[PDB]
Amino acid sequence: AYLLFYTEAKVTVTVK
């Protein structure tokens, strides 16, 4: 799986 960084500042870290 990847660690993904969704970003605006703020970031959301996801495991996909």
Q: Which residues bind Na ion (CB under 5 A)?
A: 8, 10
Q: Which residue has the tokens 């996909």?
A: 16
The contact pattern for its own copies, residues 1-16, with x = CB under 8 A and - = no contact, is xxxxxxxxxxxxxxx-
Q: How far is the CB of 9 from its own copies (least distance, A)?
A: 7
Q: Which residue has the tokens 């799986």?
A: 1
CB of 1 within 8 A of CB of 15?
yes
By a kind-dependent CB cut-off of 5 to 8 A, residue 2 interacts, out of Na ion, its own copies, none, with its own copies
Q: How many Å apart are CA 16 and CA 9, to the nearest integer?
A: 22
Q: How far is the CB of 6 from its own copies (least distance, A)?
A: 7
